[PDB]
Design a protein around this ligand. Structure first.
Ligand SMILES: CCCCCCCCCCCCCCCCCC(=O)OC[C@H](COP(=O)([O-])OCC(O)COP(=O)([O-])OC[C@@H](COC(=O)CCCCCCCCCCCCCCCCC)OC(=O)CCCCCCCCCCCCCCCCC)OC(=O)CCCCCCCCCCCCCCCCC
Ligand SMILES: CCCCCCCCCCC(CCCCCCCCCC)(CO[C@H]1O[C@@H](CO)[C@H](O[C@@H]2O[C@@H](CO)[C@H](O)[C@@H](O)[C@@H]2O)[C@@H](O)[C@@H]1O)CO[C@H]1O[C@@H](CO)[C@H](O[C@@H]2O[C@@H](CO)[C@H](O)[C@@H](O)[C@@H]2O)[C@@H](O)[C@H]1O
Ligand SMILES: CCCCCCCCCCC(CCCCCCCCCC)(CO[C@H]1O[C@@H](CO)[C@H](O[C@@H]2O[C@@H](CO)[C@H](O)[C@@H](O)[C@@H]2O)[C@@H](O)[C@@H]1O)CO[C@H]1O[C@@H](CO)[C@H](O[C@@H]2O[C@@H](CO)[C@H](O)[C@@H](O)[C@@H]2O)[C@@H](O)[C@H]1O
Ligand SMILES: CCCCC/C=C/C/C=C/C/C=C\C/C=C\CCCC(=O)O[C@H](COC(=O)CCCCCCCCCCCCCCCCC)COP(=O)(O)O[C@@H]1[C@H](O)[C@H](O)[C@@H](O)[C@H](O)[C@H]1O
Ligand SMILES: CCCCC/C=C/C/C=C/C/C=C\C/C=C\CCCC(=O)O[C@H](COC(=O)CCCCCCCCCCCCCCCCC)COP(=O)(O)O[C@@H]1[C@H](O)[C@H](O)[C@@H](O)[C@H](O)[C@H]1O
Ligand SMILES: CCCCC/C=C\C/C=C\CCCCCCCC(=O)O[C@H](COC(=O)CCCCCCCCCCCCCCC)COP(=O)([O-])OCC[N+](C)(C)C
Ligand SMILES: CCCCCCCCCCCCCCCCCC(=O)OC[C@H](COP(=O)(O)OCCN)OC(=O)CCCCCCCCCCCCCCCCC
Ligand SMILES: CCCCCCCCCCCCCCCCCC(=O)OC[C@H](COP(=O)(O)OCCN)OC(=O)CCCCCCCCCCCCCCCCC
Ligand SMILES: CCCCCCCCCCCCCCCCCC(=O)OC[C@H](COP(=O)(O)OCCN)OC(=O)CCCCCCCCCCCCCCCCC
Ligand SMILES: CCCCCCCCCCCCCCCCCC(=O)OC[C@H](COP(=O)(O)OCCN)OC(=O)CCCCCCCCCCCCCCCCC
Lengths: 89, 90, 91, 179, 469, 486
């Protein structure tokens, strides 16, 4: 549970403490979902069931469609502006 | 290019009626005096006089009435009476 | 830095708190690290066909949780409609 | 009955808690700000917050435990005196006397209103309608709180109200009877 | 029959042109009306609070959920009856309030996402349905792409909703780690005694609650509500609130919760004192959303909150809906129009509205008195029935702070009237064109519910008694 | 079918008088005047021999939401009268055509709005006194406040914004605590009712802490000492009708509500706690009748006069004695006569003529208005509590009842006869005497309608002052219904 908690906490503080660009926010958000998976899949193994793996194979998909949606949101934000700012939106 | 429509023809508002002639000459000194007295609270501040009055009439005077009212509660029973009988209860 | 040095300590220790069921708040943390014990693996001969993991996911998504796959269709549908909802500028 | 409080122990615990609250609030103030700031201006442009979180936390619980010890009971009044001390700490930041007196009166009244209801932000599980005997009584039971009866006993109302005003241990007409 | 609509209309909207969008929305409106009329006999299924678990311990169908399930279609008819129908037939009113091509798709995808939470039993239906509706708010926000504020708002809402979605998934995973099951009834009142669950169940609550505007994190939602156009925001202020609040109220996972009681008090404080010095109307209106969504963590602390909740939700939804429709009417009479997406921005702008017409201010007066709990109105008994449950179950300081919050809030509700009944200097003498008939009949009906719902109060209590007990 | 047909005819008659005539001043007068013919015939069929409630009706029952109901299960809104409840209806209904008349030749701008609002906030305070639940008393205890807010805001004199906010805010702020104390005894007793609650006792620890929520709710409505912030500054910017109906009707409501709500189920929580009521009533009589002396405005003086008499009245109610109850009722019925007549004098007549209410302009009213200076003097000397006026019968019996309960507080409170003479006669001899003022052109004499109002409000004091027994036939049960001296 160490590797999942560490990816979650450190990815979270990498989300919170940026002021430099917009993409570090996206990729820290994506590694938080990885960090939740790393805890869930080991609880599937140690309890001997698939149902944590059921929630895993569902949240893979929701992380995917999340990225598709949110990067179309960014292209909306970029079309009207000229250049995505350093400080943020 | 965003203007409320050309189809309004909006006009002026009257209250309607009769211009009553002035039965009173207003005095500027009395007017500004009264405007100073009614809105007195917007400029009130705490001084030693203000604090003395607020200490007496809000704190000391209800406490004195409280002492008199809660101590002398069911003492007096002046309904009939006689001579030498108890006038109080306690 | 002085907020990170607080939040590291607090968020890690609290993220290691809820795996325990006591009510002491120091025996809760010390059950996260006090696990150096080797699980014993027995052989049971009850399984006959190689239903591995992916077979069981395909059995549970399709029978026991068919509705989650079928709402999932709507989510992937939305992931197709959304970028065309935004990034097209029709006419 | 009750148990007296360790004023020094509870005060030094609250002093440590107020220290930690001042540190985490100064860390919050650095990062939620603008302009040139570094590691050392944590306590330079701090706005004086660690004194707030320290002084309120000492004064409230010291005055609370002292008032609960010298009165030898626990009710909402101890929260009134402790909130008066907290208003004294929070009133001294603005160096003016009628401000200060107002902080001490009003914060003490607000903390006394908090203490009188139960000194809890949540509820008490027991001693409320869903988990307390309510409705009428069934027999000659001692009428507890939340309950209604039809006629109280007179020996109980004379103990509660008094023996004065109009209330008497015998009703007035059968007290004046022909034999 | 949502998906029977969605699958059909998505093929129908794929081929229709940009001019056809109004009449598409008109079709969907009438469809939802007849789904409410011809299919509302399913109340008979429950008669004694009978609950069905459907799709195999996955959805949960009871009568609380049937009422929310009916409420959402009704308010969607009122919302879709706005985009279908012209306000006036002018050049301005065509270039204002234009519905996009994919908007009517995203509404019904959001209603699918909102209904699959109130009906939800499993955690995986919870997670998939909060995701479906969170995407739909990401895209209902951003569909007016050629707006600077709307694009910035959608990008903010994205990352904040993303953090709270991972916090919910962490809580779900953690409850799975301490107990093998996902369903909430694996609790069944023997776990909670012998098991420290308080931290998990609050973090599951606080994950949804912070998505709605629980007040340490209230600053981002007010910014999104002020930045979207004035018709996206009536929908995206109503829907996620009522959907997850009826989730968290149906499944009472945080009783006696001290964190919930603190944040309830903090909500009632900062909402009622945040709306005080504010000059923008959607702001004022969104903090009125905040205090009223903070008479909600209160009932969430309770046990058996299904008269207070449901009555107050349909109160709040009618009142909410009506006052947004009032300022959508009020934009014709104002003198200054900025910002095509968001035409009235300031509450200074609707001055002298009584001299323009008096009956729109009569309507505005009954709704603003219904927000502040004035007793012959329907909004009064909502606060009355919250207080018959707060005091019933031991929350006494909560009751005093509830009262003080209502009094501080009324101070900025009444600012709308203080502005709207004043002298204007430029009165209207004759309007050439008149407002659309059905779209003002909807507001007249929503008024007469508010002003005459105490008539049927007693019938509702008897009906309620039968069908939830 | 018949009573529906009456309504379908009367709404049509209203519609056609709206169509042909422009104002509905005449039809509002006709309706509010027929209310007298109705309520007097209700007074004829009133059985005085029964403590009982005679005329009972439930509205908004389950089985019949739109109208009357006869079922064995009742969850509607009860309504009825006896005695007490009926004297104040008779106070009301003979006053509302006088406020409806009171602004006859005055309004000139949206008159149909104004008279609708005035008649409506009169009908709501009729049904205040008809009500019988705790909620049906309460749902009309603030149906007034919307229409009072808008009647002060529009049609208020100047700086009517602040007065309108005060009449919402203070009344609401004290009213929510009344709602708390109603909620508590509606979840304990499960009955909102004015009939059964003599039977229900409560624990003294429960009865103690729900009396607070009603007492600091009537502290706002009859404005006692940490309140009466708002009373003069809602008067001083009100219009004419909304000042008469405020000071004659809205104030006596909490005099009625301390009888109806508090005294018969809070019986044991009061005798511990009457000597806080004596503190608060005395230092409203001592304090608010002493701040009257230094007042530049002319309507504000009659406002604080209303405070001082309503502070005398609630130490007659809270006496737990038999003369004080009847004395406070005759105060409430006589102050509601003498006081709106004074508001016709201050902002009624004199503000219509000269439009400024500062005292300093106004002297020498006798030389050009003799038959107004008479109405200055006899109506002032009626307010002080000269006998034979009906104010003295009430002041006398209430000071006597408050002398029974605690004689030191009655002896101190007896000074109110002096303190009520001081400011009223100081005002009367500033207005009445002196050379006719410089600032003041000579305007009309007091006209036929502003005499027709006045002589009604003067005879109706003098009849009570010559015979206060003309309403003992109603009240002699309610003199007994509220005594707990075992
Ligand atoms: C009945 C209503 C009761 C409540 C409201 C009554 C109004 C009080 C007056 C307030 C005021 O005027 O402040 C102005 C003041 C602004 O100063 P200003 O406007 O520049 O001063 C000019 C004035 O003219 C002031 O200048 P001045 O010379 O005219 O007056 C000097 C001084 C004089 O002060 C007064 O005006 C009041 C004096 C009363 C004396 C009474 C004597 C008789 C008894 O003015 C003050 O500084 C008053 C400060 C009092 C603060 C009280 C805070 C109570 C919070 C309650 C929350 C619930 O406001 C503040 O100081 C900031 C307040 C911000 C909120 C703080 C919240 C802290 C909460 C802490 C916890 C409390 C308990 C919570 C529950 C506990 C359990 C968890
Ligand atoms: C306990 C009593 C302890 C004694 C306190 C009296 C007290 C509190 C009274 C509050 C009572 C609360 C009521 C609630 C009761 C609840 C049951 C009121 O002190 C008042 O005393 C009066 C008489 O001395 C003054 O009147 C006027 O005086 C002249 C100008 O001072 C005029 O020329 C004159 O025309 C007036 O006569 C007031 O100005 C003064 O505020 C505080 O006194 C002190 O406050 C401090 C801070 O301010 C003051 O500091 C200064 O003020 C600036 C001047 O602005 C200075 O520039 C500045 O150097 C400094 O900052 C002190 O000076 C002193 O005042
Ligand atoms: C309308 C505006 C007025 C505002 C009033 C709000 C304040 C009301 C508070 C009073 C009340 C709530 C009742 C409220 C009901 C209506 C509320 C109405 C509106 C609410 C807005 C809270 O009572 C609290 O009072 C506090 C101080 O008084 C105490 O402080 C704290 O003290 C320390 C630990 O004790 C702490 O360590 C300390 O930290 C705190 O300081 C608390 O202990 C106590 O719980 C009383 O409830 C309780 O009363 C007691 C009898 O006393 C009853 O038990 C009885 O036992 C026998 C004795 O005969 C009999 O068998 C029987 O009689 C009954 O079984 C209970 O059943 C229970 O119900
Ligand atoms: C997003 C990014 C995702 C990030 C992930 C990384 C971390 C995630 C964890 C955080 C998740 C989010 C946190 C949300 C807030 C946590 C909620 C929380 O406090 O519950 C606490 C648990 O009491 C601890 O034992 C709390 C003690 C916790 C241990 C303290 C931490 C140690 C720090 C050491 C320095 C209690 O609640 P509660 O009011 O119901 O509890 C009350 C109360 O405890 C009792 O007195 C009442 O009688 C009872 O009714 C009960 O209801
Ligand atoms: C949903 C409706 C309710 C929302 C709030 C709910 C209240 C609870 C239930 C209410 C039950 C509602 C029943 C429908 C009521 C039916 C109804 O009265 O005729 C309609 C209203 O028709 C809707 O406006 C239809 C209403 C919306 C439905 C849109 C599709 C049809 C009355 O318009 P109207 O005569 O003034 O319209 C006139 C008239 O048609 C002609 O003079 C002209 O052609 C036209 O320009 C206009 O001046
Ligand atoms: C001919 C149609 C023409 C087109 C109209 C289109 C849409 C009309 C939509 C709504 C109109 C209002 C209907 C309200 C139904 C409430 C049912 C109910 O009280 O719910 C109760 C429980 O509620 C609650 O807990 C509390 C809800 C509190 C409501 C607060 C506001 C109420 C005051 C006004 C509402 C009543 C006004 C009546 C106007 C004549 C459950 O009972 P139920 O689920 O079996 O009732 C539905 C049966 N049904 C489907 C056949 C109708
Ligand atoms: C052993 C360890 C001992 C210490 C443990 C105690 C920890 C307590 C921590 C409290 C920290 C204070 C929170 C804080 O940092 O506030 C600062 C932040 C912004 O404040 P700032 O920008 O500096 O000033 C702007 C004023 N306009 O303000 C914020 O916006 C932060 C949001 C508030 C923090 C949430 C707290 C929830 C409870 C609120 C109290 C409500 C009580 C209701 C009664
Ligand atoms: C304006 C309207 C808004 C209201 C404003 C009120 C502001 C708050 C004022 C201060 C209230 C806080 C007072 C703390 C009282 C603490 C307390 O414990 O009271 C004890 C007493 C009952 O205590 P008990 O346990 O029964 O034992 C003694 C019985 N003689 O009970 C009492 O002493 C009575 C306490 C209430 C006194 C009324 C105060 C005004 C309300
Ligand atoms: C400001 C805005 C807010 C203000 C709120 C004010 C709400 C007032 C609503 C009043 C509606 C209820 C009126 C009660 C009915 C009065 C009545 O009794 O009328 C007669 C008839 C009932 O007849 P019945 O009950 O059968 O008994 C007859 C035996 N003689 O009753 C009827 O036939 C019905 C007649 C009333 C119809 C009202 C229709 C709505 C009006 C709008
Ligand atoms: C019994 C009396 C009550 C019902 C009587 C209604 C019939 C008469 C209506 C009327 O004539 O006045 C309505 C008013 C005037 O309009 P109108 O007369 O047609 O033209 C102006 C001519 N000077 O039309 C209007 O201008 C009304 C505009 C209202 C402006 C805001 C005032 C709101 C007052 C209502 C309170 C709001 C909330 C009520 C809450 C419940 C409280 C009971």
């Amino acid at each position: 549970m160490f590797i999942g908690t560490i990816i979650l906490v450190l990815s979270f503080l990498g989300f919170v403490f940026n002021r430099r660009n917009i993409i570090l926010a996206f990729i820290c958000l994506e590694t938080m979902l990885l960090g939740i998976n790393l805890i869930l899949l080991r609880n599937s193994v140690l309890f001997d069931d698939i149902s944590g793996s059921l929630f895993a194979i569902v949240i893979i998909i929701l992380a995917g469609v999340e990225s598709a949606i949110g990067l179309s949101l960014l292209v909306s934000y970029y079309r009207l502006r000229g250049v995505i700012n350093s400080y943020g939106i | 290019e965003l203007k409320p429509s050309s189809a309004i023809q909006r006009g002026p508002l009257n209250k309607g009626g009769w211009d009553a002639p002035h039965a009173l000459h207003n005095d500027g000194a009395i007017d500004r005096y009264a405007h100073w007295r009614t809105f007195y609270q917007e400029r009130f501040k705490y001084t030693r006089a203000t604090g003395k009055s607020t200490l007496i009439f809000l704190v000391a005077f209800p406490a004195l009435i409280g002492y008199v009212a809660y101590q002398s509660e069911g003492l007096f029973e002046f309904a009939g009476k006689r001579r030498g009988e108890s006038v109080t209860t306690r | 830095l002085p907020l990170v040095l607080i939040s590291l300590i607090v968020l890690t220790i609290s993220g290691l708190m809820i795996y325990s069921n006591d009510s002491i708040l120091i025996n809760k943390l010390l059950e996260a690290f006090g696990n150096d014990y080797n699980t014993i693996i027995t052989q049971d001969w009850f399984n006959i066909e190689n239903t591995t993991l992916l077979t069981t996911i395909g059995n549970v998504l399709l029978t026991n949780n068919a509705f989650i796959l079928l709402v999932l269709a709507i989510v992937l549908l939305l992931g197709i409609i959304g970028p065309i909802s935004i990034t097209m500028k029709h006419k | 009955h009750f148990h007296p409080y360790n004023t020094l122990g509870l005060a030094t615990q609250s002093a440590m808690v107020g220290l930690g609250a001042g540190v985490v609030a100064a860390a919050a103030r650095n990062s939620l700000a603008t302009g040139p700031r570094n590691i050392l201006t944590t306590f330079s442009k701090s706005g004086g917050v660690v004194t707030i979180f320290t002084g309120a936390s000492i004064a409230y619980v010291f005055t609370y435990c002292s008032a609960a010890n010298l009165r030898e009971r626990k009710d909402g009044w101890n929260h009134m005196w402790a909130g008066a001390a907290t208003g004294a700490v929070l009133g001294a930041r603005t160096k003016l006397v009628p401000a200060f007196i107002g902080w001490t009166v009003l914060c003490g009244a607000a903390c006394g209103l908090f203490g009188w209801t139960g000194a809890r932000f949540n509820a008490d599980r027991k001693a409320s309608l869903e988990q307390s005997p309510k409705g009428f009584v069934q027999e000659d039971a001692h009428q507890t709180f939340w309950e209604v009866v039809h006629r109280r006993p007179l020996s109980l109302t004379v103990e509660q109200l008094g023996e004065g005003r109009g209330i008497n241990a015998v009703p007035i007409a059968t007290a004046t009877e022909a034999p | 029959m949502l998906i029977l609509a969605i699958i059909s209309l998505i093929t129908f909207v794929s081929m229709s042109k940009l001019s056809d969008n109004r009449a598409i929305i008109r079709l969907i409106n009438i469809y939802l009306i007849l789904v409410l009329v011809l299919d509302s006999f399913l109340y008979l299924l429950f008669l004694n609070n009978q609950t069905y678990t459907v799709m195999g311990e996955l959805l949960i169908f009871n009568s609380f959920t049937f009422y929310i399930d009916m409420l959402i279609y009704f308010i969607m008819i009122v919302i879709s009856s706005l985009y279908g129908y012209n306000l006036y037939n002018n050049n301005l009113y065509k270039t204002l309030f234009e519905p996009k091509k994919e908007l009517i798709i995203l509404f019904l995808i959001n209603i699918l996402g909102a209904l699959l939470i109130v009906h939800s039993n499993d955690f995986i239906t919870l997670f998939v349905a909060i995701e479906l509706q969170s995407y739909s708010i990401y895209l209902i926000t951003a569909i007016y792409n050629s707006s600077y504020k709307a694009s910035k708002a959608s990008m903010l809402y994205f990352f904040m909703g993303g953090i709270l979605s991972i916090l919910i998934a962490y809580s779900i995973n953690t409850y799975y780690s301490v107990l093998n099951s996902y369903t909430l009834h694996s609790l069944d009142s023997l776990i909670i005694n012998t098991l420290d669950l308080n931290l998990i169940l609050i973090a599951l609550s606080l994950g949804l609650l912070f998505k709605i505007g629980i007040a340490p994190l209230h600053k981002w939602l007010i910014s999104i509500y002020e930045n979207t156009p004035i018709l996206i925001t009536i929908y995206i202020s109503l829907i996620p609130k009522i959907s997850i609040l009826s989730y968290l109220v149906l499944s009472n996972i945080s009783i006696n919760s001290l964190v919930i009681s603190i944040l309830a008090i903090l909500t009632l404080l900062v909402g009622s004192v945040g709306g005080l010095l504010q000059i923008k109307i959607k702001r004022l209106l969104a903090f009125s959303g905040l205090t009223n969504a903070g008479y909600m963590m209160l009932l969430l602390l309770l046990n058996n909150n299904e008269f207070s909740y449901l009555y107050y939700i349909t109160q709040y939804s009618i009142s909410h809906l009506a006052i947004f429709m009032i300022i959508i009417f009020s934009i014709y009479y104002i003198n200054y129009i900025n910002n095509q997406y968001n035409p009235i921005i300031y509450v200074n702008q609707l001055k002298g509205l009584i001299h323009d017409n008096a009956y729109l201010v009569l309507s505005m007066a009954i709704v603003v008195f219904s927000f502040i709990g004035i007793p012959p109105l329907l909004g009064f008994f909502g606060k009355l029935n919250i207080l018959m449950s707060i005091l019933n179950n031991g929350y006494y300081f909560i009751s005093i702070v509830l009262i003080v919050a209502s009094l501080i809030s009324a101070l900025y509700y009444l600012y709308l009237l203080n502005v709207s009944i004043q002298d204007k200097n430029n009165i209207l003498i004759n309007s050439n064109e008149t407002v659309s008939s059905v779209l003002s009949y909807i507001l007249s009906s929503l008024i007469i519910l508010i002003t005459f719902g105490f008539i049927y109060n007693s019938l509702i209590i008897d009906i309620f008694n039968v069908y939830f007990n | 079918m018949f009573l529906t047909s009456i309504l379908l005819s009367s709404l049509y008659l209203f519609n056609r008088i709206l169509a042909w005539q422009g104002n509905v001043k005449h039809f509002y007068l006709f309706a509010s005047n027929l209310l007298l013919l109705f309520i007097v015939v209700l007074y004829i069929n009133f059985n005085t021999f029964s403590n009982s409630f005679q005329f009972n009706f439930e509205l908004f029952n389950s089985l019949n939401p739109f109208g009357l109901s006869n079922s064995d299960i009742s969850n509607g809104l009860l309504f009825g009268i006896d005695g007490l409840s009926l004297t104040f209806i008779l106070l009301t209904v003979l006053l509302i055509p006088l406020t409806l008349l009171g602004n006859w030749y005055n309004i000139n701008f949206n008159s149909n709005l104004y008279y609708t609002l005035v008649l409506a906030i009169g009908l709501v305070i009729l049904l205040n006194f008809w009500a019988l639940d705790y909620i049906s008393f309460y749902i009309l205890f603030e149906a007034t406040l919307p229409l009072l807010f808008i009647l002060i805001h529009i049609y208020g004199s100047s700086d009517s914004e602040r007065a309108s906010f005060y009449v919402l805010m203070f009344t609401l702020s004290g009213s929510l605590f009344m709602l708390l104390s109603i909620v508590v005894i509606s979840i304990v007793l499960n009955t909102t009712n004015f009939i059964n609650h003599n039977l229900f006792v409560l624990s003294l620890d429960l009865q103690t802490i729900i009396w607070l929520g009603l007492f600091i709710a009537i502290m706002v409505k009859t404005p006692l000492f940490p309140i009466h912030v708002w009373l003069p500054v809602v008067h001083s910017e009100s219009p004419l009708a909304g000042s008469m109906i405020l000071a004659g009707l809205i104030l006596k409501l909490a005099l009625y509500a301390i009888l109806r709500l508090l005294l018969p189920l809070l019986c044991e929580a009061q005798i511990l706690y009457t000597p806080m009521i004596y503190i608060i009533s005395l230092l409203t009589i001592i304090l608010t009748s002493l701040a009257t002396l230094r007042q530049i405005d002319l309507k504000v003086i009659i406002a604080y006069s209303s405070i001082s008499h309503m502070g005398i009245a609630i130490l007659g109610v809270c006496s737990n004695t038999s003369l004080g109850i009847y004395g406070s009722i005759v105060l409430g019925v006589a102050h509601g006569f003498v006081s709106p007549a004074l508001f016709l004098i201050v902002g009624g007549i004199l503000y219509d003529r000269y439009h400024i209410r500062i005292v300093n302009y106004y002297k020498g009213l006798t030389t050009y208005m003799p038959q107004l200076a008479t109405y200055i003097i006899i109506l002032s000397f009626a307010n002080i509590g000269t006998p034979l006026t009906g104010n003295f019968t009430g002041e006398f019996l209430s000071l006597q009842g408050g002398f029974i309960r605690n004689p030191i507080i009655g002896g101190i409170s007896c000074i109110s006869v002096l303190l009520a003479a001081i400011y009223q006669l100081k005002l009367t001899n500033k207005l009445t005497g002196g050379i006719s003022s410089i600032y003041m052109h000579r305007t009309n004499d007091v006209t036929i309608r502003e005499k027709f109002i006045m002589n009604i409000l003067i005879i109706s004091t003098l009849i009570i002052g010559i015979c206060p027994q003309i309403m003992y036939n109603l009240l002699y049960w309610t003199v007994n219904n509220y005594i707990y001296i075992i």
